[PDB]
Design a protein around this ligand. Sequence first.
Ligand SMILES: CC(C)=CCC/C(C)=C/CC/C(C)=C(\F)COP(=O)(O)OP(=O)(O)O
Ligand SMILES: [Mg+2]
Ligand SMILES: [Mg+2]
Ligand SMILES: [Mg+2]
Length: 324
Amino acid sequence: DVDFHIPLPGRQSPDHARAEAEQLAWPRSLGLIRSDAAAERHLRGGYADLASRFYPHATGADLDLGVDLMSWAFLFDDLFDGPRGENPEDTKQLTDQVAAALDGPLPDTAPPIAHGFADIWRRTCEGMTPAWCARSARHWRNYFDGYVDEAESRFWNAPCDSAAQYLAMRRHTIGVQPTVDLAERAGRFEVPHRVFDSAVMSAMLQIAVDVNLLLNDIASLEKEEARGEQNNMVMILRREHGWSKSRSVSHMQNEVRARLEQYLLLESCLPKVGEIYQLDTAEREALERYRTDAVRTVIRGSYDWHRSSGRYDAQGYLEELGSS
Ligand SMILES: CC(C)=CCC/C(C)=C/CC/C(C)=C(\F)COP(=O)(O)OP(=O)(O)O
Ligand SMILES: [Mg+2]
Ligand SMILES: [Mg+2]
Ligand SMILES: [Mg+2]
């Protein structure tokens, strides 16, 4: 394994054991897991474990919603490992059918992976402000559009020539922002909307995004070499800077450290940011909950899970999830 500077406390929901025990019931009822071998491959992903560390403040049905999001997100992502992920028109055809759930009811003929997302989104929005739902829906659309962009890069044989071009694409496909959004829903709070848009909070969220994708590109480095993948930060640094493999990995460790140090600086600015936006007492507490239960958790929880998950330790078996 490889070590990273993550000076944040590890946390896990106290209801994790029940959530992990019951995690299969929902994707089974939605037709997303259709065999016992698929169920065991799901269990080996550790997706309830991941959700319990993203959402340690959540228990019960709130934590279950977090588990189902992790379950759905990785099932969805596995539909693009084969030829579909090499074809933007076929990628967009699936993402369009899923994203349609944001706009209204799905037709009964929608593929199972789309009905599963619609069930998550319905539970995500109920009880939040309408403006929160609209903003979170926009985050989902950025995520789905990102899959189309990635399929374009593969189809036209245009690999990313620089770290900046990769991040501009990978910051959306990494799915961190929809994960952070659910921490708010799972915690039954909303960070003040004018502070979510602030330059300081945007920089904190960008660090959370960047750290997650750097962690993921290292944890999945072996798999993606064995498939000749070129849009991986390790590979892209070797092309952009002409460096070896051991240098690019050390560069990514230092970047994680530098961004975590900057993240701490930005946290110390939040009291003055609240003053600038004239937050009252309640809004200040909501901002503090966002900092500790949403942004900090998505950084730290990802670090613990990328080391233990079975995804980083039968192709086409999930194809029927994307068939109308
Ligand atoms: C845990 C994180 C980062 C986010 C929370 C769950 C969500 C919404 C994940 C989005 C999908 C994702 C990051 C991958 F599939 C990993 O990237 P990639 O497909 O390149 O590598 P693999 O994980 O498939 O090997
Ligand atoms: Mg994948
Ligand atoms: Mg993928
Ligand atoms: Mg990866």
